[PDB]
Amino acid sequence: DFTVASPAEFVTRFGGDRVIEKVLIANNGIAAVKCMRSIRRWAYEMFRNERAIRFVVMVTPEDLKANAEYIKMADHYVPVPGGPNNNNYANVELIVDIAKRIPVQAVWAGWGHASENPKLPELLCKNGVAFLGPPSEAMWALGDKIASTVVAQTLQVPTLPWSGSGLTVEWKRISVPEDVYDKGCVKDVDEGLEAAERIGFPLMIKASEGKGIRKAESAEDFPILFRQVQSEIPGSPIFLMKLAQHARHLEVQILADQYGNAVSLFGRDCSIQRRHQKIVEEAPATIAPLAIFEFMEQCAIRLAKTVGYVSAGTVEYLYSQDGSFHFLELNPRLQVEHPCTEMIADVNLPAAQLQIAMGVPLHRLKDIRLLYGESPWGVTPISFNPPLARGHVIAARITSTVQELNFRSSKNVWGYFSVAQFGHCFSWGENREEAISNMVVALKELSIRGDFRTTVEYLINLLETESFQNNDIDTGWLDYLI
Numbered sequence: 126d127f128t129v130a131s132p133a134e135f136v137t138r139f140g141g142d143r144v145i146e147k148v149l150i151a152n153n154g155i156a157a158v159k160c161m162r163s164i165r166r167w168a169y170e171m172f173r174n175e176r177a178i179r180f181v182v183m184v185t186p187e188d189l190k191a192n193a194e195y196i197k198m199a200d201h202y203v204p205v206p207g208g209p210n211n212n213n214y215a216n217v218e219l220i221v222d223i224a225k226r227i228p229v230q231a232v233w234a235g236w237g238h239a240s241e242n243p244k245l246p247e248l249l250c251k252n253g254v255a256f257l258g259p260p261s262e263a264m265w266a267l268g269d270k271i272a273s274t275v276v277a278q279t280l281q282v283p284t285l286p287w288s289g290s291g292l293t294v295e296w297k298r299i300s301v302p303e304d305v306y307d308k309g310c311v312k313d314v315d316e317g318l319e320a321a322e323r324i325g326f327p328l329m330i331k332a333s334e335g336k337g338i339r340k341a342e343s344a345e346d347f348p349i350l351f352r353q354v355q356s357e358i359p360g361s362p363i364f365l366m367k368l369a370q371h372a373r374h375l376e377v378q379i380l381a382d383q384y385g386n387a388v389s390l391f392g393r394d395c396s397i398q399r400r401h402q403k404i405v406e407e408a409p410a411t412i413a414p415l416a417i418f419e420f421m422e423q424c425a426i427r428l429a430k431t432v433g434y435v436s437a438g439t440v441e442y443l444y445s446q447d448g449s450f451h452f453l454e455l456n457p458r459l460q461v462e463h464p465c466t467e468m469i470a471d472v473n474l475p476a477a478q479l480q481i482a483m484g485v486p487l488h489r490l491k492d493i494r495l496l497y498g499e500s501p502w503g504v505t506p507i508s509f510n511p512p513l514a515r516g517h518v519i520a521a522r523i524t525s526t527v528q529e530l531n532f533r534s535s536k537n538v539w540g541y542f543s544v545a546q547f548g549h550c551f552s553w554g555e556n557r558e559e560a561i562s563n564m565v566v567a568l569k570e571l572s573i574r575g576d577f578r579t580t581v582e583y584l585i586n587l588l589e590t591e592s593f594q595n596n597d598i599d600t601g602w603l604d605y606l607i
């Protein structure tokens with residue numbers, strides 16, 4: 126075998142280009158915790174030293190007074206101002222400044238806050254600090270819903286009917302010229318109603334700079350709701366997109382390195398949604414048959430490659446019961462539900478992020494090699510007979526600084542909830558059915574505490590409906606998610 130005792134040694138062994146010893150976590154709560162546990166576990170496996178990578182957390186006074194756990198957990202911490210996100214966690218200039226001063230070699234922002242802000246990887250890059258996420262050029266291309274959909278369309282990925290249906294760019298960096306935006310947008314209600322005629326109702330009237338989304342059911346209530354999206358986000362171009370019909374939101378999980386290699390990691394399915402929120406996510410997305418899902422994975426990989434994506438991102442689609450599907454978006458970050466994917470794929474995602482930020486290519490990540498059925502520490506490249514998902518995972522959102530829930534019911538279920546009082550439970554079974562029933566048994570146990578009873582019993586029932594056991598897709602028009 127081989128031995129590495131420090132991050133600098135690891136980089137030499139695994140053909141990387143930047144040594145990361147210390148990471149600044151630009152988040153709190155469960156995200157901070159997850160980042161540290163996932164990376165520490167990989168540190169132990171690799172270096173036999175769980176502290177081989179050090180962590181620095183930012184800490185608001187709210188969190189310091191409370192003695193939130195992530196503080197104790199971290200190697201060193203930096204007090205930051207209280208208030209709303211612009212001060213502290215979503216303040217790019219503050220993040221960079223703290224990163225430069227420590228110093229750290231990279232930043233992980235997770236999800237929330239500043240994770241989607243391209244200024245973050247731009248300002249880090251200029252200051253020579255790594256980002257655990259995609260670079261700003263990729264983040265910009267996906268920043269505008271207009272540029273994003275027409276990029277998708279030029280790769281011949283299916284999209285829903287909309288104001289810029291059929292628009293295309295000539296296809297090293299992909300750009301979308303004024304001409305295309307002008308035809309993809311609607312300037313005013315007149316043009317909106319003309320556009321609405323090619324698309325049909327109901328549609329979303331939506332502002333590409335922003336949240337700022339309205340649902341319109343007819344030509345008669347369009348003008349008011351348009352004037353409303355306009356006045357909500359001033360200066361934004363707006364476009365229109367039709368709703369899907371008998372559909373679910375689903376996601377391909379992509380992982381890319383810094384050399385143009387990208388891999389799909391199965392996907393996720395949102396089987397229950399309410400008021401624009403993900404109540405139940407599943408992995409893999411069994412609702413979609415393989416032949417069709419593999420094509421959605423090929424589409425996401427194409428998209429990821431052409432915008433020059435790095436790190437872990439998700440490609441969101443809409444899937445109809447009649448097998449049709451449509452690109453919606455590339456979310457340029459980890460999501461809170463990512464453990465679903467880790468579990469079924471045996472990929473430690475934040476440790477994959479860390480290694481990729483060190484310039485390690487995909488075929489040198491042990492987890493990826495094993496997934497693709499290769500030796501754990503070989504060096505030969507791999508072309509991304511597909512790997513099989515390992516079992517099935519239900520994740521459920523639970524409701525009414527962080528409390529953990531290790532369930533007595535099963536080693537296969539775990540959850541958490543946070544005061545500033547919502548969270549998730551994650552359940553693994555050998556198949557969908559075992560995963561559901563593990564979940565139910567765990568929630569029955571949750572529902573013993575007075576704080577969760579009312580809300581969890583509601584959830585238990587939801588998981589026990591024939592429509593859920595059968596994985597039926599709701600009829601009618603599909604609402605958007607946040």
Ligand SMILES: COc1ccccc1[C@H](Cn1c(=O)n(C(C)(C)C(N)=O)c(=O)c2c(C)c(-c3ncco3)sc21)OC1CCOCC1
Nearest residue numbers: 155159162461464465467468518536537538539551552553
């Ligand atoms: C029974 O645990 C399951 C079941 C189904 C799916 C996922 C899990 C678990 C849930 N989970 C945890 O078990 N743990 C503990 C520490 C108990 C752990 N490290 O085993 C977690 O910390 C944890 C955390 C911090 C999770 C999380 N943080 C943010 C979102 O999810 S999910 C999760 O995710 C796996 C954790 C090990 O690495 C691969 C993911």
